[PDB]
Amino acid sequence: EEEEDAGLVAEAEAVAAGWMLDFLCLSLCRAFRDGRSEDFRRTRNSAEAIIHGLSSLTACQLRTIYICQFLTRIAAGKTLDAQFENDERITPLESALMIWGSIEKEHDKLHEEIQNLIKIQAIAVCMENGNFKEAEEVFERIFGHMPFKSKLLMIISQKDTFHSFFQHFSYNHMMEKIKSYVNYVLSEKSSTFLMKAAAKVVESKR
Amino acid sequence: EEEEDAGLVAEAEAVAAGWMLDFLCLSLCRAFRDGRSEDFRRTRNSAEAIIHGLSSLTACQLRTIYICQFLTRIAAGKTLDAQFENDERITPLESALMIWGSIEKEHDKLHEEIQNLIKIQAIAVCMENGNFKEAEEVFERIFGHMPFKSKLLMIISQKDTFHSFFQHFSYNHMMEKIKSYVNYVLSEKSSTFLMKAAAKVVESKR
Fold first, then answer.
1. How far does the CA of residue B59 sit from the closest CA of chain A (Å)?
2. How many domains are there within chain B?
3. Reduced 3-state DSSP string for chain B
4. Which of A53, A195, A197 minimises the CB distance to B46?
5. Is-contact A84 B77, C-beta < 8 A?
6. I need a surface site. Which of A14, A194, B18, B68 has the fewest CB within 10 A?
């Protein structure tokens, strides 16, 4: 009853923390889709602290954490100063591409298009800051897609930062395709417990 | 319906964050009472990130945040390197005494005893590290209680760190009286929504 009641409290705290993680993961995907940057930053901070207080995760919770990590790297894609991997040479977009190709999800046409847009922008960001040598290094770690492969290497060699290819397959196009995926994810979210109860309370005051 | 549905989502996220704050505040008080230091540290980190994502707080939530801040300063009472106030001269125990005397709560006999134990230990910690001049400064900011007042100044002057007075009114005695208060608080917690639902789930698997 002493060590038993303490165990029961710990079990409930673990169920409650699991609900908090699920809610925060959904709120982060929502903030990303709506372009609410500060909300995404604050909710990411909350979700990370919550993950540190949990000792067990379901496969569904782990999968959801991976997608949220992908979104964080995409948001920091233009922050080449950001290091998400032990290898400090890995650019944020390279890290997102690694998660994108590791998540257990359908490799539908949208999946491949997002993948191909991340590869192009991984090189574009380096060129848009004049890190042309870094651009070649990223190209080697990604292109080591034949028609696009030769086109990108010729743009790195010519040093044309303001090339038309990058404008057609822009950072905004990449962001929009990624936002279309998040919407579908939220659509099939299956409704988290915390959101359902809170929404009931809100409606119960209308 | 566009700006209306977005508002409804924000309202639900605010109700959900309020439930998360209440749960985390209770889990922090529990970790303090049980002496689970690492759990208190991790839950404090989670509660701070949650507070940063909320824009409205009830008087009951604000009062609960004050008590949790008091516990954090008590836990860092021996960490004289910790600065909780803009004035870097204020020791952690001095900051806790300031909150303790500011919370809206009954000034019962337990309240005064906790207050008097915090005052004595505020001086003891400084003496136990040889910061005798700092001890006098803390004494001036607190004792500026006649029978205890003269006794403490004579101990600072004599520089007796290992004095019997501090052993009788020890840091552990202060910790135990503070733990008795937290228990009563949790006893009248009124049961938070998240804890109630989670405990139901746990029992529903016994």
1. 20
2. 1
3. CHHHHHHHHHHHHHHHHHHHHHHHHHHHHHHHHHCCHHHHHHHHHHHHHHHHCCCCCCHHHHHHHHHHHHHHHHHCCCCCCCCCCCCCCCCHHHHHHHHHCCCCCCCCHHHHHHHHHHHHHHHHHHHHCCCHHHHHHHHHHHCCCHHHHHHHHHHHHHCCCCCHHHHHCCHHHHHHHHHHHHHHHHHCCCCCHHHHHHHHHHHCCC
4. A53
5. no
6. A14
- Chain A residues with CB under 8 Å of B197 CB are 16, 19, 193, 197
Q: What is the DSSP letter of A193?
A: H
Decide if B200 is inside a domain.
no
Angle between helix A2-34 and A193-203 (nearest 10)? 70
How far is residue B174's CA from residue B162's CA, in Å, rounded to a whole number?
17
Method: X-ray
Q: What is the CATH number of the domain that holds B160?
A: 1.25.40.210
- Give the Cα-Cα-Cα angle A39, B11, A190 (nearest 5 degrees): 80
Q: Are A118 and A100 in contact (CB under 8 A)?
A: yes
Please measure the distance between the N-terminal and C-terminal CA atoms of chain A and give it in whole angstroms: 45
Query: Of B45, B53, B197, which has the smallest distance from its Cβ to A52's Cβ?
Result: B45
Quick check: is B83 in a domain? yes
Does B203 map to a domain? Answer: no
Q: What is the resolution of this structure in A?
A: 2.1
Q: A76 is in which domain, residue-wise?
A: 2-193
**Structure tokens of B136?**
């006098």
In 3-state terms chain A splits into helix, strand, coil percentages (rounded to 5) of 75, 0, 25
CB B15 within 8 A of CB A204: no
- B164 assigned to some structural domain: yes
- Integer Cα distance of B135 and B94 in angstroms: 12
